[PDB]
Nucleic acid binder design. Structure first.
Ligand SMILES: [Zn+2]
Ligand SMILES: [Zn+2]
Lengths: 179, 243, 259, 246, 258, 179, 245, 258
RNA sequence: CCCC
RNA sequence: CCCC
RNA sequence: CCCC
């Protein structure tokens, strides 16, 4: 039975190499979390019976645009796709214009609006983001005028109530309510 | 009230080193990160753990590690004479002390500028609730998967008619001559450090060193029940995936 | 605040299905979730009930004890409903005195109980002038997955219905069961635009905190109602949801026979 | 306590569909941005509106829309037996529902990151003051020129001796069978939708539906007085404009 | 501090005016604004009154009811003075429990009444050391254009002078007027430098919260005074203001000849 | 009678053009406020019985200076000449060195000060301020050291308490208490 | 129980004359942790005062760009009075604290420390007539001991009124059965009373009596002040004696 | 943070000396600093006492008065024990009570008194089931240089011993010395690594609020203890520290009775 | 309440 | 207060 | 508590 409680002794340090779920103290390795201890190539990890997600290069991510400076959208990265448990390393990340789309884009405000909710892939550390893929994009936007939720029509977004129209970098999953 | 020990077995029949009937269940709450329902004799408790969560509105956040909050609330119907909702002094008190336990044990350095929040309700209260509450919260902590050094397990050593007892019941508290809540860090199947220590009654030097000993028995006993429960939970996440 | 983001999206999805005449779990718009009603959860307490409504669960316990009547109203027992939506019953609860939502929740449960004359307040009198019974109904959320209100009115009336008066030990006679003569039930609905969703769940609430609650007695009289949230209620809609709700209330009452 | 209706008349002599005497005066306070004094039966209420004004804590603002606060409060002397100052369960609640009445109707979109504060105090209270406070508050908001989809009007219906009566009086709340405060949004001189709706009592599903009918007829009468209050206010600012020229 | 850019300017103006020895409205430096004292405005109250002091408005309501006397004084019975400066008047009025001002205001008014011995407590005694009348004075500001204090004081006494005891209601005999033996009045001046301004505008009040308040009885005895705000008071100037205030109080008192 | 109340039908959205005081909905136009209905040139508006001023280009405005940079001066705008009502669009307008006195200036320090009270003219939105006018400028300045209100002395400001003199872009209304 | 008599044979219930202060003691710099402190007995009153600052200020929305902010909490320990009193703020204490603050607001040179808070705590160990005056006297000593720049000192006494005569620095029985109680506090600059900082009053007093009391007060103020000077001299010697150890 | 910076360097120092098995003041690891107990510091107070302990100092005053016992015991009077860690004693300390630490120190101290049965609540019985002597005991910290706790325990047992029951003033008989049986004494030690300390000092506290506290009665029984802070207590230490405590509590009880 |  |  |  590979099962371990936090505090269970996995072994000595020189013996095994500390991995996820494991801590050392006095040269011994220990299980920090309950779960299935696994060992491979001298590396001892513990699959947690309740993992705390960590965001990393590669991941998909949900966020809100909290502040648009120039050439730069600051997104508030909230959830890491595929895990419901709120991540440990969430907070601000950066959506730089180069990454906003594969084409060429100027004036980032024409892709990503204040308070937009979006869907992005993490391409660098410090939560740096990419929107270039088709999947990635703005998931929901409010009318920049009357603050009503914008409905997707075509390649552009329209406000029903007010009829206005705004151009954005639009995830396929816009309005779907999924990501 | 006339006499606590007759024949050498207490008013409810237990030994001197016999715990009460315990019952422990992890993951009882949908909208919580970890949880645990437990009962110790007549105590009916439930702990919930949320976190690591962003800590708000701001500023109270520690930049190098995580902060631990712990609110111990007794509900109105939990006691004989209906309590009045709101923090007693006893409450603010028990909360500082219970919180201090987990500060020793949680690995807060892993989660800077964050909160790990512990709330525990007592649905029915008996002698020992404070001790049932820690055990519960400890299970919720593991359930919630917050990295810890080991487990926290807690028992009350009392003393009736000159003799020590394990996990005192009401009458023994109301007419006993001691009441001493412990709580240990269990690491590697064994009792290591003391995490929580509170005595108040009359006890000799030599009674006290004994009592410590009587306690770390109840503790390995309970710890096992705690393992059994986090194991039952283990089978379940395992069954839900395997589906 | 980052919590808001998960919810705004869930909102978009709930509104998508609504647009296609569906609820995200396949329920009818006039359909409650699975109701469990477990009495006697709390020994020491005189009455008590655990209720499960979907994944939402609540306890209520009833404690009684002798006390002084109201100076303007003697001859009547006293019933005092209170609720605690504690930290742990939700990621979104902060500790302290009741917020305004913890308050209206109790005032509604109390309203149904009182306006229906559910308990016979007169038979709770001990000494006509200044000794009378004092019924404490205390609601305590444990798991909040939408519609704690209906769950609470349901457990409340359930707890009272398993209440034993603690006569002896107060030296007032022998212990008897409390004279419950009615069965308040409340049906709450999430209004959205010009449609309604009877018995909303936490997920559905993402849409917004805009409800209607109608409470009835055992004779299908309307006994308490409460619109709540920032919205305009259509009269046609109100009229139609009046009838659906009284009806729903009949079915929940049927779960109280319990054979 | 004997009977509340006899020979078709209520203890104060009104028929079942008759309002209590109402007086409404707008623009009564000098420091508020809008205000209204209002008498309804033996109710004496005064409303003040403040805003749109800046809002702190900077966290409690709404990036996209105005926030709305509404404090309803009884002066110690307003009741028959002095009332402690300070909130109680009943006040937290009334403040809440009453706010939400107005959240529905004020055009908050126009004033992002702002607050619109409505204060309402009952100086002398009879039956139906929540009702009085709502009406006074509406007039106040219009007088403050804060944008609204329409008017809020409010009347309560009750039940005595098994009869539905409009605008209940004190003896009728205390010894009746039902108490049901409404508030309607008014647009085009017509009732459009319900903005506030509470009931306590025992009514048949039929009586509810009949009650909404009585409330409406009455609410339209009250709305004509609210209008006249502003009509006066309007005549008066123009009259003052004509005085400066004089 | 955004609501006080406008204030700071008005302060300048009031000040550029003072320099010319002039108030913003033409008043003399000892001239109260117009005054109205309306009694009986709250019927469901035992006594009540509404005072107008310029565009300043305050209403006071009195309520009486049986109670236990002071453990100390089993004779006479009690007067409690409370004040709500609720957000009704002034945006600077925040909601909630008493602020230092609502308190200071109540305590000053309470003082002038208490110390002038204007109401015979020993009169409203029911059962020696058992049951006794308790008299609640509740001050409720409405429109604040400066001097809520003086206005409340004016209103509180008018309220009390038009109070009927609730005897019948309390099976205690027929109802009767509350015996009022004095007439506390108080004059608040805004001290600015070495000059005073009697009965300040809210506008004049822009200069600073720096005042002196003097309160006299029937016979011109000073019965309560209060310096408030953080300024230093010239004894020279205090000496005039005393004389001026006892005077101002007198003129004010001959208003109550209804 | 041109008087209208909020909620009153004005006409079809096809017919007229929403002006100040009117909102559109369901194809109709309605009064948002009470006041005088005016229809000049297909355009319908209501004159509020209590207008809420809004700062635009051309408006003479007042404010305090909350932050100095090098090229720019940040002024917390607060009031619009004409009404006593707080304006809806209140906040931080901007004072660029060039827009000050129709002549060279090295630092706005030379013109404005921290906690100074200003009287500007709006040059553009986001409250782009000017003060070139004789009417415009500082209205009340505090001494850099000692912090007492400084009194004007011809073309310069000096405090009485201390004596130090400072030089700023002075409004002809400085000290007057008016603006 | 009431003396009924008060002034007798020209001398009061404790034997003082109409213008004689009760015995005053005044130690400077008694607290180690505070920036400046002062123990001070006045008749039966025993009070203690600490001072802290100028220091940083949270919230900071409460901080003032151009000058320091001042706070003063006047606090009567439970065992200080006759019938043990509930700890914490009553309305009387709140009022006293507002006015006591304002006295020093006049004198402290706030401008030298923008964005800061000088805070003053005064603790009444044993209560008796005019303790608000003891406290004020004690704070000014603490202020000075703390070296907070000030325009001049602050000193205070109350004038009472017994059996028709103005008395100085009133004691309990003459404050409870007397006919008036009137605390002053003065700015003392250049060894002479210069301004009034604090002025309250209550009871029946004639115009002529008010002005008389002011004279009576100042005379007391100057007498007290002298003791304050001496309290500080002692300090001056100590910090010197420490160098010089 | 930002006082949290100066303290951190001090912390380095204290540890650096513990690395050398010596302290900052050359004190020994089982040694309290200068003690001093002054009874009768507050007359007009049935009890009082002031304890300086190093630079720490605290006053404690006992008050007494007629009152009703709790529903349970009709057979005895009662003892309440509150405290205040005023800002007098420190910058940090909150103004308004009761903060949590306040609550703590009070209770620890109440435990020892109530647990030593060091007062005969049976002898404070006015009349059974209605009136009994209610003994207040308020701790008021004056200066905080560390271990206000121990200080407060001592000062409270000094004060209670020197307490005169105000029987006369209340019409119940001739005043008497308060019947005090036992003499509880608390020893707080500060813990870091395997090493205990003193009787800790504020400078030593810089290391962290990780302490142990054991209270003994005259006969050397333990009547109360209290781990406190966020640390793991090695059982071996506790063992020693149980002995070392009991002995420190006797050196003090002599410093008590002279 | 007021007072201390 | 103290306990729960 | 409930209503006012
Ligand atoms: Zn739009
Ligand atoms: Zn200067």
């Amino acid at each position: 039975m590979r099962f371990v409680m936090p505090g269970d002794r996995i072994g000595s340090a020189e013996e095994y190499v500390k991995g996820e779920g494991v801590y050392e103290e006095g040269g011994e390795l220990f299980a920090a979390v309950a779960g299935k201890l696994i060992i491979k190539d001298r590396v001892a990890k513990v699959e947690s019976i309740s993992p705390i997600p960590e965001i990393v290069k590669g991941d998909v991510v949900l966020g809100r645009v909290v502040d648009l400076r120039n050439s730069i959208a600051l997104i508030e990265v909230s959830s890491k796709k595929g895990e419901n448990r709120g991540p440990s390393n969430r907070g601000i990340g950066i959506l730089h214009v180069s990454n906003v789309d594969e084409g060429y884009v100027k004036e980032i405000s024409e892709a990503v609006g204040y308070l937009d909710i979006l869907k992005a892939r993490v391409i660098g550390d410090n939560l740096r983001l990419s929107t270039k893929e088709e999947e990635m994009g703005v998931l929901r936007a409010l009318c920049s005028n009357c603050k009503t939720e914008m409905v997707r029509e075509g390649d552009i977004l329209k406000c029903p109530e007010c009829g206005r129209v705004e151009k954005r970098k639009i995830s396929t999953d816009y309005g779907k309510g999924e990501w | 009230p006339e006499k606590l020990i007759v024949d050498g077995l207490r008013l409810d029949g237990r030994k001197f080193d016999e715990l009460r009937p315990i019952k422990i269940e992890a993951s009882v709450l949908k909208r919580a990160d970890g949880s645990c329902y437990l009962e110790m004799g007549k105590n009916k408790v439930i702990a919930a753990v949320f976190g690591p969560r962003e800590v708000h509105p701001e500023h109270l956040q520690d930049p190098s590690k995580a902060i631990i909050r712990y609110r111990y609330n007794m509900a109105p119907f939990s006691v004989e004479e209906r309590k009045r909702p709101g923090p007693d002094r006893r409450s603010i008190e028990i909360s500082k002390v219970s919180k201090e336990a987990f500060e020793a044990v949680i690995m807060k350095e892993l989660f800077p500028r964050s909160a790990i929040d512990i709330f525990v309700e007592v649905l029915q209260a008996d002698a020992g609730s404070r001790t049932a509450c820690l055990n519960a919260a400890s299970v919720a902590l593991v359930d919630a998967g917050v990295p810890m050094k080991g487990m926290i397990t807690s028992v009350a050593v009392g003393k009736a008619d000159g003799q020590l007892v394990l996990d005192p019941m009401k009458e023994e508290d109301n007419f006993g001559e001691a009441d001493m809540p412990f709580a240990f860090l269990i690491r590697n199947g064994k009792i290591e450090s003391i995490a929580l220590l509170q005595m108040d009654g009359r006890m000799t030097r030599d009674e006290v060193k004994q009592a410590i000993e009587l306690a770390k028995k109840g503790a390995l006993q309970i710890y096992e029940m705690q393992r059994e429960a986090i194991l039952r939970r283990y089978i379940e996440v395992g069954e839900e995936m395997d589906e | 605040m980052p919590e808001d983001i998960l919810v705004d999206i869930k909102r978009d999805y709930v509104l998508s299905k609504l647009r296609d005449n569906e609820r995200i779990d396949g329920r009818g718009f006039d359909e409650f979730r699975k109701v469990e009603i477990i009495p006697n959860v709390i020994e020491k307490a005189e009455g008590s009930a655990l209720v499960k409504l979907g994944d939402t669960q609540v306890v209520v316990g009833v404690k009684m004890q002798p006390g002084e009547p109201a100076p303007d109203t003697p001859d009547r027992g006293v019933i005092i409903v209170n609720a605690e939506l504690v930290p742990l019953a939700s990621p979104t609860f902060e500790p302290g005195p009741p917020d305004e939502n913890s308050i209206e929740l109790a005032r509604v449960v109390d309203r149904g109980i009182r306006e229906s004359e559910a308990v016979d307040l007169s038979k709770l009198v001990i000494e006509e002038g200044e000794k009378v019974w004092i019924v404490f109904v205390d609601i305590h959320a444990l798991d909040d997955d939408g519609n704690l209100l209906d769950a609470s009115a349901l457990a409340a009336i359930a707890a009272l219905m398993n209440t034993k008066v603690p006569a002896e030990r107060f030296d007032l006679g022998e212990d008897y069961l409390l004279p419950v003569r009615d069965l308040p039930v409340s049906v709450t609905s999430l209004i959205v635009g010009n449609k309604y969703l009877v018995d909303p769940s936490r997920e559905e609430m993402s849409v917004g905190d805009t409800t209607l609650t109608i409470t009835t007695d055992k004779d299908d009289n309307v006994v308490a109602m409460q619109k709540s949230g920032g919205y305009l209620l259509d009269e046609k809609l109100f009229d139609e949801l009046l009838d659906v709700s009284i009806n729903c209330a009949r079915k929940l009452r049927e779960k109280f026979k319990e054979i």
